[PDB]
Tab-separated table of C-alpha atoms in Angstrom:
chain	number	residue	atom	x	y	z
A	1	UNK	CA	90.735	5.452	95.240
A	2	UNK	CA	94.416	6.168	95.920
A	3	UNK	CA	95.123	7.855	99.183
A	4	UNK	CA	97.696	9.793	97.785
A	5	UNK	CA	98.721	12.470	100.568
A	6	UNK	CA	100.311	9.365	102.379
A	7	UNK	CA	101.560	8.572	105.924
A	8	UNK	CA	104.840	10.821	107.650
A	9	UNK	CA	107.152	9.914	110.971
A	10	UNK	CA	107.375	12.676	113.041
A	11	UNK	CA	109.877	14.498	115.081
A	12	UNK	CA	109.175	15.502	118.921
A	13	UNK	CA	111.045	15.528	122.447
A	14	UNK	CA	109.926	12.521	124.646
A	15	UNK	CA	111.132	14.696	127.525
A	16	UNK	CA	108.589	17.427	126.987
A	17	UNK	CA	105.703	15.492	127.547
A	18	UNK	CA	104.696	15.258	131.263
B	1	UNK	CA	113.324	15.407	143.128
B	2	UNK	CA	112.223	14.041	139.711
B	3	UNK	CA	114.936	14.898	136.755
B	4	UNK	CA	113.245	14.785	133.579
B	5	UNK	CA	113.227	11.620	131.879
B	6	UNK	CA	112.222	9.412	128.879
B	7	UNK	CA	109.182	7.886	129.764
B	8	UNK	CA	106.682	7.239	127.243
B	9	UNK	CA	103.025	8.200	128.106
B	10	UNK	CA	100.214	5.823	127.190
B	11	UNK	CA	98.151	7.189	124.261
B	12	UNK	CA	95.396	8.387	126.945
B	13	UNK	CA	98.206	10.863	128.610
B	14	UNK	CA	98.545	11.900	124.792
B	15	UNK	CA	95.343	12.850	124.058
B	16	UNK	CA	94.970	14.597	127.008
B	17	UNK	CA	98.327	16.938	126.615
B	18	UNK	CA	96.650	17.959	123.644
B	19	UNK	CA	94.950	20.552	125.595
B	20	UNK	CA	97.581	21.568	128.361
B	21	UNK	CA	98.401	24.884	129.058
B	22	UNK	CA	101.480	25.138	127.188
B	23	UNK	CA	101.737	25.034	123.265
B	24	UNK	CA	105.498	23.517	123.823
B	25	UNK	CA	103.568	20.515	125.257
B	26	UNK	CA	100.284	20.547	122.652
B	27	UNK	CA	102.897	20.671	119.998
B	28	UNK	CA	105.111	17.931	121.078
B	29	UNK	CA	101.987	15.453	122.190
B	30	UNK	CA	100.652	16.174	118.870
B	31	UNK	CA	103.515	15.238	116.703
B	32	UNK	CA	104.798	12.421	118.880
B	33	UNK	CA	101.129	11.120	118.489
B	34	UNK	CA	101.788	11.779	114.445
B	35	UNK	CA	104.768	9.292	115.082
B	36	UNK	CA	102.293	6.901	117.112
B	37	UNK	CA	100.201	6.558	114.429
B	38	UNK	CA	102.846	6.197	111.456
B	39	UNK	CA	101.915	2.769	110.029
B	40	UNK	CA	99.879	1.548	112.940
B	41	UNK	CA	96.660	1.295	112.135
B	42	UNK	CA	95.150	-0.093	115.320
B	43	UNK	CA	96.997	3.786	117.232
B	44	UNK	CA	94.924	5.482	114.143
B	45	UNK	CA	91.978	3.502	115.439
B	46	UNK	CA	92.811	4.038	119.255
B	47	UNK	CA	93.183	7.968	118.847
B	48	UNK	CA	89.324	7.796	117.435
B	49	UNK	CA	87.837	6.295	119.966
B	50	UNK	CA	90.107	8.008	122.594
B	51	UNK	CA	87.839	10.749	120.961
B	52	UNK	CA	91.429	12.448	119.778
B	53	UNK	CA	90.118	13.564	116.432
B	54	UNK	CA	88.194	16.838	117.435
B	55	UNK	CA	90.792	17.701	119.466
B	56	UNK	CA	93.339	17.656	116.607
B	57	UNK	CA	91.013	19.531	114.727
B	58	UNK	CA	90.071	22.047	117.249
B	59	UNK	CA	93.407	22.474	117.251
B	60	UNK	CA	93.757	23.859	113.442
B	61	UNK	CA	92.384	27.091	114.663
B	62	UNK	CA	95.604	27.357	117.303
B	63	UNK	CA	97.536	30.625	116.505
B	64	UNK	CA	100.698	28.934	116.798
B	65	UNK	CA	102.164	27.218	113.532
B	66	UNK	CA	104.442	24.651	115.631
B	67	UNK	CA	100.644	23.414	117.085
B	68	UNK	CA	97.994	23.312	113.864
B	69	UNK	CA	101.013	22.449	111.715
B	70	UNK	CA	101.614	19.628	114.547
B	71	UNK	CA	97.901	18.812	114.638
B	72	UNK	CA	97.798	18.815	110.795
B	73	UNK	CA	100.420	16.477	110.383
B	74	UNK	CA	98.741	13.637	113.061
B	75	UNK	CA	95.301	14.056	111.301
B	76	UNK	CA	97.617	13.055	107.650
B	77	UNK	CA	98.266	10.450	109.162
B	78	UNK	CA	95.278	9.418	110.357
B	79	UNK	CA	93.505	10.281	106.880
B	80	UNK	CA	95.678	7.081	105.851
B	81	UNK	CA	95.325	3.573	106.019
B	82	UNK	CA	92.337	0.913	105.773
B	83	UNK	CA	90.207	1.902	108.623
B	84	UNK	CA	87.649	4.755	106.822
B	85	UNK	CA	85.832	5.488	110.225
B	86	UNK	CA	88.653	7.304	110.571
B	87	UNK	CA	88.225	9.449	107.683
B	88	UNK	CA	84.953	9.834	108.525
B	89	UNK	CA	85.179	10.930	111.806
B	90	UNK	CA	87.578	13.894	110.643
B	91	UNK	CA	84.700	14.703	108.377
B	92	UNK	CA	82.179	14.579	111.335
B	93	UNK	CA	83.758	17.364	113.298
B	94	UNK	CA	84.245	19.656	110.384
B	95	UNK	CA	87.639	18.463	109.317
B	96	UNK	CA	87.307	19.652	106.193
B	97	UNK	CA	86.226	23.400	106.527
B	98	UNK	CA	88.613	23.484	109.259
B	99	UNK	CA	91.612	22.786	106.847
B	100	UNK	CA	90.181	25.203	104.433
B	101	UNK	CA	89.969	27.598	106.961
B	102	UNK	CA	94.334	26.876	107.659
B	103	UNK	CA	94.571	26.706	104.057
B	104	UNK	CA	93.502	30.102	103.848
B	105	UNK	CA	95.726	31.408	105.998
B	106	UNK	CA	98.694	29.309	105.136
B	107	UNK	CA	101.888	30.932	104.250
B	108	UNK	CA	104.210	28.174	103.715
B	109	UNK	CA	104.924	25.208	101.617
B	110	UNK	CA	105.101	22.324	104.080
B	111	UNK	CA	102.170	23.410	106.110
B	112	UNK	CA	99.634	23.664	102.737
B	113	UNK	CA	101.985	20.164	101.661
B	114	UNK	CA	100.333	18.413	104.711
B	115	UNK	CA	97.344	20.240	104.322
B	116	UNK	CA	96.638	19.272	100.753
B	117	UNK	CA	98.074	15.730	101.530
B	118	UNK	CA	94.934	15.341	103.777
B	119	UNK	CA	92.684	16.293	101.689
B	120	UNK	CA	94.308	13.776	99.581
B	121	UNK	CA	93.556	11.079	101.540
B	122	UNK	CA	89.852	12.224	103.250
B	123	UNK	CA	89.089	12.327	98.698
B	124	UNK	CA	89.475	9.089	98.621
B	125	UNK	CA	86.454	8.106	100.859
B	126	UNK	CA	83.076	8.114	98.682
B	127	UNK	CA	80.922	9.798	101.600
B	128	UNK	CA	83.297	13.070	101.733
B	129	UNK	CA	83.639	13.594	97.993
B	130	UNK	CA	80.624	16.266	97.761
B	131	UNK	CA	81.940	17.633	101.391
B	132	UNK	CA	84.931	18.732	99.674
B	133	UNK	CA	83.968	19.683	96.564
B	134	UNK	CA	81.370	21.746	98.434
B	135	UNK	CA	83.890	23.717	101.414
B	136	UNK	CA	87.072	23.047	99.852
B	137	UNK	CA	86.649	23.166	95.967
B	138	UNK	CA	87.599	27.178	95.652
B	139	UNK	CA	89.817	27.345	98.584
B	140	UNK	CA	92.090	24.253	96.753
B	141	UNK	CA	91.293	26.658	93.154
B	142	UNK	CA	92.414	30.006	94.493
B	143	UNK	CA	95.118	29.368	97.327
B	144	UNK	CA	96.608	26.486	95.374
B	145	UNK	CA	95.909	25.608	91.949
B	146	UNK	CA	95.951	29.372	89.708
B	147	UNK	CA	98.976	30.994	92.313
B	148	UNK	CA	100.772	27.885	91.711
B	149	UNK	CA	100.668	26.848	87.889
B	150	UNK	CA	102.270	29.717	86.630
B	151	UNK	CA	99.002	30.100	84.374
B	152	UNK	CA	98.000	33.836	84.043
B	153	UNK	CA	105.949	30.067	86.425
B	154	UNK	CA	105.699	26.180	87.799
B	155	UNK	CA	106.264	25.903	91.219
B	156	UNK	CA	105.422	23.762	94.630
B	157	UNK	CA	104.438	20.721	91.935
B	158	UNK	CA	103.869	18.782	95.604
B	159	UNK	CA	101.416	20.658	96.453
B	160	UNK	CA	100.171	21.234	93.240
B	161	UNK	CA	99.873	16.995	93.144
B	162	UNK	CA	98.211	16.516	95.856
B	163	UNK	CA	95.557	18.796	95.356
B	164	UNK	CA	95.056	17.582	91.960
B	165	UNK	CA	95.076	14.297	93.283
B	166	UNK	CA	92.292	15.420	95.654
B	167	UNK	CA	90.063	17.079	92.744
B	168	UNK	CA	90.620	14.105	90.944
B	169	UNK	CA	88.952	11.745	93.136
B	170	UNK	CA	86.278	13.972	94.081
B	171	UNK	CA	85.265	14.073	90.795
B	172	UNK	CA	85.221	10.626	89.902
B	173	UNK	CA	81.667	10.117	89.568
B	174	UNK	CA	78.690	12.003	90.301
B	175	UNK	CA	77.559	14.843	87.453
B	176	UNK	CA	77.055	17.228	90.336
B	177	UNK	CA	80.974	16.881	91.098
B	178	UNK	CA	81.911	17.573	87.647
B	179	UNK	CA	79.706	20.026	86.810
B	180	UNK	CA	81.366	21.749	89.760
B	181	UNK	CA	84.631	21.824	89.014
B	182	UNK	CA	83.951	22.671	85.415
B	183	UNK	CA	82.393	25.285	86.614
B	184	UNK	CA	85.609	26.681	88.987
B	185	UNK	CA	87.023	30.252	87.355
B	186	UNK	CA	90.843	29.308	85.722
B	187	UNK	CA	90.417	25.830	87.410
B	188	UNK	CA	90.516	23.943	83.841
B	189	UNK	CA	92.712	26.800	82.199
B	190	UNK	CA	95.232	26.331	84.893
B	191	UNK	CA	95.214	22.220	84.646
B	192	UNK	CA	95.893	22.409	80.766
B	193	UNK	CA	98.560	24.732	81.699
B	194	UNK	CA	99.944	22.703	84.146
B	195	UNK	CA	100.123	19.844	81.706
B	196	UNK	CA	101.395	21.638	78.934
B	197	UNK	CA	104.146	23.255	81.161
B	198	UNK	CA	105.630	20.114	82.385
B	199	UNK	CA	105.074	18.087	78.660
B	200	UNK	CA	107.647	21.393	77.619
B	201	UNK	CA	110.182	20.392	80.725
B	202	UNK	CA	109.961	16.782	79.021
B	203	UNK	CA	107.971	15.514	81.965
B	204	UNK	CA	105.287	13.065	80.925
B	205	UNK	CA	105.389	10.673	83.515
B	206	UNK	CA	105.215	12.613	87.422
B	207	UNK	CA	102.402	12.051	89.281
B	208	UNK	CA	101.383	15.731	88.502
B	209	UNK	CA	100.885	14.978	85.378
B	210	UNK	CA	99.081	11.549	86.153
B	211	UNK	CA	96.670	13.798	88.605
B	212	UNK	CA	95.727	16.810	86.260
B	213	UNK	CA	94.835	14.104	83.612
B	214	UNK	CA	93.303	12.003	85.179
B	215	UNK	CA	91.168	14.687	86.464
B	216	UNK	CA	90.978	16.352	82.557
B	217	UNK	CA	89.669	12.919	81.503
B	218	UNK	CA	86.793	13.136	84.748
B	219	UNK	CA	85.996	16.242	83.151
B	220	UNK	CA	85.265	15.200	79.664
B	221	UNK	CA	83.696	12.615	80.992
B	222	UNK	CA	79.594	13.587	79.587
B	223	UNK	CA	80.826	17.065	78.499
B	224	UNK	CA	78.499	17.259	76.222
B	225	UNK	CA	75.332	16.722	77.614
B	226	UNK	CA	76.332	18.316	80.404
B	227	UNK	CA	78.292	21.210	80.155
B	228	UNK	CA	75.729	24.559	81.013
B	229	UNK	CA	73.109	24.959	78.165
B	230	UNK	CA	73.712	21.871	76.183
B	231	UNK	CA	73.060	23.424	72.846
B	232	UNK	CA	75.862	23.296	70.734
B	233	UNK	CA	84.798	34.998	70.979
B	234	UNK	CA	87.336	33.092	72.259
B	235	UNK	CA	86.840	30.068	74.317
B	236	UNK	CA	87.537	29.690	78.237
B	237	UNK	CA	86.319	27.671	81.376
B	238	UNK	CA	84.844	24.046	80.174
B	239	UNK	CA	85.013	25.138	76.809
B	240	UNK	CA	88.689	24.543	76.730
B	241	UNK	CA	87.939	20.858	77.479
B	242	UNK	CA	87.038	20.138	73.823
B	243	UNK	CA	89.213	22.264	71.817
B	244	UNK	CA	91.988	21.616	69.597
B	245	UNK	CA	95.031	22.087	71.947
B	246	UNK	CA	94.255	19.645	74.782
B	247	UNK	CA	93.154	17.020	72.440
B	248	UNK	CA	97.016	17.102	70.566
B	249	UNK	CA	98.116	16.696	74.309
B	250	UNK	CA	96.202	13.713	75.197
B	251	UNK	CA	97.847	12.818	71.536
B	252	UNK	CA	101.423	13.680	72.119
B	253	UNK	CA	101.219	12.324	76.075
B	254	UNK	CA	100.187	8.901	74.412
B	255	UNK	CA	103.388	9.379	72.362
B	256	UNK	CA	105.777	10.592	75.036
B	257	UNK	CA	104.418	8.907	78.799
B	258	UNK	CA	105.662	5.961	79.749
B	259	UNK	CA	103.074	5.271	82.300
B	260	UNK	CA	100.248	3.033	82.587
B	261	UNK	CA	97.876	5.209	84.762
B	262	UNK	CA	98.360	8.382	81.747
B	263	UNK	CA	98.198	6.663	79.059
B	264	UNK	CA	94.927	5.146	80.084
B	265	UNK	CA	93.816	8.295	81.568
B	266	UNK	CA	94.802	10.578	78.258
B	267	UNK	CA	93.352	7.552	75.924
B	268	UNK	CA	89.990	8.074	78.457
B	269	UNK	CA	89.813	11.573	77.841
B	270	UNK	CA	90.068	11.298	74.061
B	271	UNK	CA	87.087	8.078	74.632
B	272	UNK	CA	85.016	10.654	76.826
B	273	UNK	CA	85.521	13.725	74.311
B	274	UNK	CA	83.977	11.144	71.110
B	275	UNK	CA	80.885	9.752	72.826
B	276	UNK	CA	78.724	12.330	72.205
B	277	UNK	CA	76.826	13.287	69.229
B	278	UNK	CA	77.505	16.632	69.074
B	279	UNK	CA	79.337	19.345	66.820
B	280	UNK	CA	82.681	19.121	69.041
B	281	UNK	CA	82.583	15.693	68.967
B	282	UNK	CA	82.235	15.370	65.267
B	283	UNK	CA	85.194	17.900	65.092
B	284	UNK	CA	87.667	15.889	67.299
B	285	UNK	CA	86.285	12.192	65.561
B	286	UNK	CA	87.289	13.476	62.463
B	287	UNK	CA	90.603	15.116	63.560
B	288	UNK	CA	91.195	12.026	65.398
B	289	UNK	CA	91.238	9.380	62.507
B	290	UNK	CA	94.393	10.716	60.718
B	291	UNK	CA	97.590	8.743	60.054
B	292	UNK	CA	99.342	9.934	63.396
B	293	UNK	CA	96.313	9.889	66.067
B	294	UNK	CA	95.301	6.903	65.062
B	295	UNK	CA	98.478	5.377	65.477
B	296	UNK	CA	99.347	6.862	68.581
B	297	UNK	CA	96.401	5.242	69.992
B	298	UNK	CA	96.340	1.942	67.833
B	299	UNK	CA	99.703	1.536	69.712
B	300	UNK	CA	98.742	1.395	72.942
B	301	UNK	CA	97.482	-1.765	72.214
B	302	UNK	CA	101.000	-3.435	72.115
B	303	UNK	CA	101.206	-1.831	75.565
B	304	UNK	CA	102.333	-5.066	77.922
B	305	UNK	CA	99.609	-3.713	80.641
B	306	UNK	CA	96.136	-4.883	80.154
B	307	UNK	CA	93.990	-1.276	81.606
B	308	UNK	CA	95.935	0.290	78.594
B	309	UNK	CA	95.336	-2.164	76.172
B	310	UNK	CA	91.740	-1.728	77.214
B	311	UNK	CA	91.692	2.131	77.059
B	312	UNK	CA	92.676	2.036	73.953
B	313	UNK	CA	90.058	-0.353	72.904
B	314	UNK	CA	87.079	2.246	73.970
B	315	UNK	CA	89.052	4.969	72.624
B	316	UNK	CA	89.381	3.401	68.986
B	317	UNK	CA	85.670	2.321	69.352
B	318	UNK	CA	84.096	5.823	69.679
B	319	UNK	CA	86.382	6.602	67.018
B	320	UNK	CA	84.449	3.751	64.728
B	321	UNK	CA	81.074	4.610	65.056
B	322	UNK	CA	80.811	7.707	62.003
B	323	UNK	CA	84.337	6.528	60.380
B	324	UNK	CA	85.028	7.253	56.542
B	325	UNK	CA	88.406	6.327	56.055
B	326	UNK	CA	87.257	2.964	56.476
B	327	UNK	CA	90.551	1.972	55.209
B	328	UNK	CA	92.084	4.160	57.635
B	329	UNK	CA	91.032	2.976	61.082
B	330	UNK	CA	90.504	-0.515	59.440
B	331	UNK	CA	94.581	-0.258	58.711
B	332	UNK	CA	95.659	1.317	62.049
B	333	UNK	CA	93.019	-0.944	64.417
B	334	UNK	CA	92.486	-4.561	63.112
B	335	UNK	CA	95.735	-6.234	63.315
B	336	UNK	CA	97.116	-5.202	66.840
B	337	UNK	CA	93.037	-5.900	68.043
B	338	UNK	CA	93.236	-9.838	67.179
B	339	UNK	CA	96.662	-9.367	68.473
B	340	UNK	CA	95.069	-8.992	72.114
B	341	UNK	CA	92.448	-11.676	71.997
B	342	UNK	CA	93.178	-15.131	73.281
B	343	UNK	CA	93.853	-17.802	70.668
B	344	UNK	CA	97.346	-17.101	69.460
B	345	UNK	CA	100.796	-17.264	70.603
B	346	UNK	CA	100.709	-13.777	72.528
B	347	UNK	CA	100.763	-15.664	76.098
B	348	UNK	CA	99.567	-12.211	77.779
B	349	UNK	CA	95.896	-12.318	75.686
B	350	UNK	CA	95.096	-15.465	76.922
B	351	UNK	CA	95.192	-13.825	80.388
B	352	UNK	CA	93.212	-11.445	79.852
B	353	UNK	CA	90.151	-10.572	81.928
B	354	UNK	CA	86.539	-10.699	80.411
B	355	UNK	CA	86.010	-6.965	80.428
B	356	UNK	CA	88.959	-6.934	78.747
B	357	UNK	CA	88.335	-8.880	75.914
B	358	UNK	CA	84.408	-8.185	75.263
B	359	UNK	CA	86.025	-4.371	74.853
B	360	UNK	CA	88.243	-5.656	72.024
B	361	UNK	CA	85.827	-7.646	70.485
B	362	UNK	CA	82.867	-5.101	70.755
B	363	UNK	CA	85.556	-2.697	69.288
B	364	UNK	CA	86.174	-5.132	66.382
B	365	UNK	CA	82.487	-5.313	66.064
B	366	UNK	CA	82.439	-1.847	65.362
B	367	UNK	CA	85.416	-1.362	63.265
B	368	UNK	CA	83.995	-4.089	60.819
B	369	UNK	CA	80.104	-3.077	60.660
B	370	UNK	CA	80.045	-1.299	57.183
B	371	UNK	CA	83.718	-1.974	56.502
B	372	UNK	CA	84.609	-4.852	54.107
B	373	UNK	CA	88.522	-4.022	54.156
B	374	UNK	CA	88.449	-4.230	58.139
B	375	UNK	CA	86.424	-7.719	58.021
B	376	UNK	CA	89.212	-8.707	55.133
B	377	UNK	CA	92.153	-7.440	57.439
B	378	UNK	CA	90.493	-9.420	60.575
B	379	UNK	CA	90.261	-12.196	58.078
B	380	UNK	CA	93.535	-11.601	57.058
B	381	UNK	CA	95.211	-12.004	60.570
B	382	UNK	CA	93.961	-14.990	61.556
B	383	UNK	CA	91.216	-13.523	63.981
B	384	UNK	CA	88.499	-15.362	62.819
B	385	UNK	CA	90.167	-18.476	64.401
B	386	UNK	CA	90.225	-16.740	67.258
B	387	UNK	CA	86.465	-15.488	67.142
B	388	UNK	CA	85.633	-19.590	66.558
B	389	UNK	CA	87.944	-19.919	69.686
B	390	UNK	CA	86.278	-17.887	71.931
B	391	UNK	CA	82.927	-18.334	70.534
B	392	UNK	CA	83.062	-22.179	71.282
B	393	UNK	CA	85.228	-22.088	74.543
B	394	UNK	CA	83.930	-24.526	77.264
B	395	UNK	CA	85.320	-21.896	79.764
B	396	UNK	CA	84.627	-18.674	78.558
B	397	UNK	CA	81.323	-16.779	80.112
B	398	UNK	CA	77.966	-16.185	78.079
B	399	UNK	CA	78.707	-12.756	77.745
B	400	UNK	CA	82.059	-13.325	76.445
B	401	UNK	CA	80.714	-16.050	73.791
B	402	UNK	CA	77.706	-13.430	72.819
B	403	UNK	CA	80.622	-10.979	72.046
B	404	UNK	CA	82.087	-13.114	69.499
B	405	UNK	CA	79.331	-14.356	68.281
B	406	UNK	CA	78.508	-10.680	67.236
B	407	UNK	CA	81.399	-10.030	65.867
B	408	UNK	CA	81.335	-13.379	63.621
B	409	UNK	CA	77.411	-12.618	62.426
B	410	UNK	CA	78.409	-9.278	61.052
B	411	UNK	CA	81.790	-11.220	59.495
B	412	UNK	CA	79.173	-13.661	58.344
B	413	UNK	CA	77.431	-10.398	56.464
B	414	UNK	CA	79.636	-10.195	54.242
B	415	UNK	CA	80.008	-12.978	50.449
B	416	UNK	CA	84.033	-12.599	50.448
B	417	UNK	CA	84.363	-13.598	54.002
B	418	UNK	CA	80.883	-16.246	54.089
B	419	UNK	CA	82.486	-18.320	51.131
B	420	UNK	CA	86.040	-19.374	52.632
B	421	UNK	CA	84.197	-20.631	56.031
B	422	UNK	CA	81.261	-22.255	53.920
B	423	UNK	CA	84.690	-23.963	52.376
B	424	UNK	CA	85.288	-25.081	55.407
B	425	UNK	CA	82.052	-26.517	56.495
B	426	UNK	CA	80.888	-23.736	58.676
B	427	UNK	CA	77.263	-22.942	58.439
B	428	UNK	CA	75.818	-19.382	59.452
B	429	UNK	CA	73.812	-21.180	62.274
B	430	UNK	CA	77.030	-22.931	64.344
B	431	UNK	CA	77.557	-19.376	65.757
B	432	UNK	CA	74.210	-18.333	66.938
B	433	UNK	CA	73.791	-15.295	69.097
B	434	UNK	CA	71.689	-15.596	72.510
């Protein structure tokens, strides 16, 4: 069947994460 | 000392920020993962086995919008794409009632829009149909569906699509499904609306549309034998499914859609409504084989895609079997029929799959049993050459040769079609059924 809800990019902040 | 920087973490790192202390770094891992896994199926695969799943879905419950609404969005994406363990593991930890439960408490358009889109794409796997039609069917009713439609204006149709998108495939198969939605307080009242709302805006094509349907035509699918105390003050719930007004939508959307996948879902809908034997049924046969139903759906046959063409076919069938404007039907069905068999100079009929063209001939069958001005029309159009043609291909499959053989025996029934063959040198025996 049709996976409808899809597939989205995303925003975040590379620097944050650490 | 160390200035911040743009170093990118390996997908273990990820996982693991998930649960640090601060939501400004549970957010930010969780939608940078999101980005990870946009069209990459072998990060979707990754995050499962990293174990990442129950994390994101732990993480549903978080207070904190910027952090479920984060997690949400990486589990969409993960919903997606061909590997279904992934799906499945989403299931496993109580995905499902775990979105319900965010649902419920939703405020907002884009977090139930990512929200619903999930569900979207976890419907699609067979194994967590029931699941959701079990934790999610009256959440998706309630908090989406009745607030939404304007049934009691239109509004959030994104939402509203992919939750009728999800219902749809839930309810694809199984009676148990079906029986369950019909069964859902305003749920079909709210879907007709829906429909009838955006037909009125002079939108017959969107995918809303499409979804509600689609899902009207799962509905009607077995109605009658199973809708509560098959037995058969104004009517509601199921009963709606089989009275006059949705049945002259499924008519006018057949007039107005452009689209392949609602015109073969309203055609479907008007095929499930006529199968049964049953007062309802008799009632929307008979309404159904007038001058402008019948063409409406005669003309889907000229329709350039072949699932059309075929819906159709089983719709003008049920329509057959306890006809009495014999001319009628006859008039509206025969000629564009032979028109989609192989043997002419329509290129597209010779392409045609079997399914395909054992529907049309199984429908000519019908439309010719106790009708000597349909078997003259066939005649009349040159479809008997193409019944020979099919019924003596070298290539064509037993099946597909049985079909036409039918179809010729009961054209051999009758004296003012035997005679013109027997002219010929055909003999009743040269087109044996087996």
């Amino acid at each position: 069947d049709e996976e409808g809800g899809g597939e989205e990019d995303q925003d975040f902040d590379l620097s944050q994460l650490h | 000392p160390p200035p911040p920087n743009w170093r990118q973490p390996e997908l273990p790192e990820v996982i693991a920020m998930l649960g640090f202390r601060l939501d400004a770094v549970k957010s930010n891992a969780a939608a940078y993962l999101q980005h990870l896994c946009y069209r990459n199926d072998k990060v979707k695969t990754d995050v499962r086995k990293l174990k990442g799943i129950p994390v994101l879905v732990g993480l549903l419950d978080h207070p904190k919008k910027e952090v479920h609404l984060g997690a949400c969005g990486a589990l969409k994406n993960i919903s997606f794409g061909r590997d279904q363990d992934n799906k499945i593991a989403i299931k496993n930890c109580d995905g499902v009632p775990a979105l319900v439960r965010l649902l419920r408490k939703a405020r907002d358009m884009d977090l139930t829009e990512v929200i619903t889109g999930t569900l979207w794409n976890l419907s699609s796997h067979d194994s967590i149909k029931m699941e959701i039609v079990d934790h999610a069917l009256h959440a998706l009713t309630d908090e989406v569906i009745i607030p939404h439609s304007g049934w009691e204006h239109i509004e959030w149709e994104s939402v509203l699509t992919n939750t009728a998108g999800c219902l749809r495939n839930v309810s694809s198969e199984r009676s148990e499904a079906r029986r369950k939605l019909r069964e859902c307080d305003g749920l079909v009242d709210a879907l007709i609306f829906i429909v009838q709302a955006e037909i009125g805006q002079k939108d017959s094509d969107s995918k809303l549309v499409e979804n509600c349907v689609c899902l009207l035509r799962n509905l009607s699918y077995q109605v009658h034998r199973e809708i509560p105390q098959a037995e058969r003050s104004p009517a509601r719930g199921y009963e709606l499914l089989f009275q006059p007004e949705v049945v002259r939508i499924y008519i006018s959307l057949l007039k107005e859609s452009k689209t392949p996948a609602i015109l073969e879902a309203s055609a479907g809908a008007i095929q499930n409504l006529c199968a049964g034997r049953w007062t309802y049924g008799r009632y929307i046969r008979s309404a159904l084989r007038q001058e402008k139903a019948l063409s409406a759906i005669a003309d889907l046959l000229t329709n350039e895609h072949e699932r059309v063409v075929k819906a159709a076919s089983g719709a003008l069938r049920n329509l057959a079997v306890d006809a009495r404007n014999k001319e009628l039907i006859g008039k509206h069905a025969i000629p564009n029929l032979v028109k989609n068999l192989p043997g002419g100079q329509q290129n597209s009929s010779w392409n045609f799959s079997e399914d395909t063209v054992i529907s049309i001939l199984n429908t000519i069958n019908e439309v010719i049993a106790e009708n000597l001005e349909a078997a003259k029309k066939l005649r009349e159009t040159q479809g008997i050459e193409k019944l020979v043609l099919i019924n003596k291909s070298g290539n064509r499959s037993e099946k597909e040769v049985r079909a036409a053989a039918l179809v010729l025996q009961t054209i051999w029934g009758y004296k003012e079609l035997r005679k013109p063959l027997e002219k010929e040198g055909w003999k009743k025996s040269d087109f044996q059924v087996n």
